[PDB]
UniProtKB/TrEMBL annotation, chain B:
Subcellular localization: Cell envelope
Listed name of the protein: Putative MacA
Entry's family note: Belongs to the membrane fusion protein (MFP) (TC 8.A.1) family.
Name of the gene: macA
Coiled coil regions in record: 11-45
Superkingdom in the source lineage: Bacteria
Length: 53, 53
């Protein structure tokens, strides 16, 4: 069996399901980034002006 | 108003409510006049204080 070869397999299920879990988490956290950034855009261009004035 | 927001509805206050201030002061000029006038005529109906020869 050449180094690093095909030998076994188990129930990878529980472990991939939780991988998919943890990639959904992320996949929403980036979608928080969307809003929790534009909110700052609306409040950067509000402030940078209101302060000048 | 050049600073993007300050809705026109509040610039228009200022415009028309400047001209109303200005003009409501003119009215009180013409009144100052009419009072200075009618007061000189009110001493010129007081010419008659010797009935000069």
């Amino acid at each position: 069996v050449k180094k690093g070869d095909l030998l076994a397999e188990i129930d990878s299920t529980t472990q991939i399901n939780t991988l998919n879990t943890r990639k959904a988490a992320l996949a929403s956290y980036q979608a928080q980034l969307v809003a929790r950034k534009t909110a700052y855009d609306v409040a950067l261009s509000n402030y940078q002006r209101l302060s000048k004035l | 108003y050049g600073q993007k927001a300050t809705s026109l509805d509040t610039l228009n206050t200022a415009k028309a409510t400047l001209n109303n201030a200005k003009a409501e002061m003119d009215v009180v000029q013409e009144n100052i006049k009419q009072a200075e006038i009618e007061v000189n005529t009110a001493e010129t109906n007081l010419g008659y204080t010797k009935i000069t020869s």
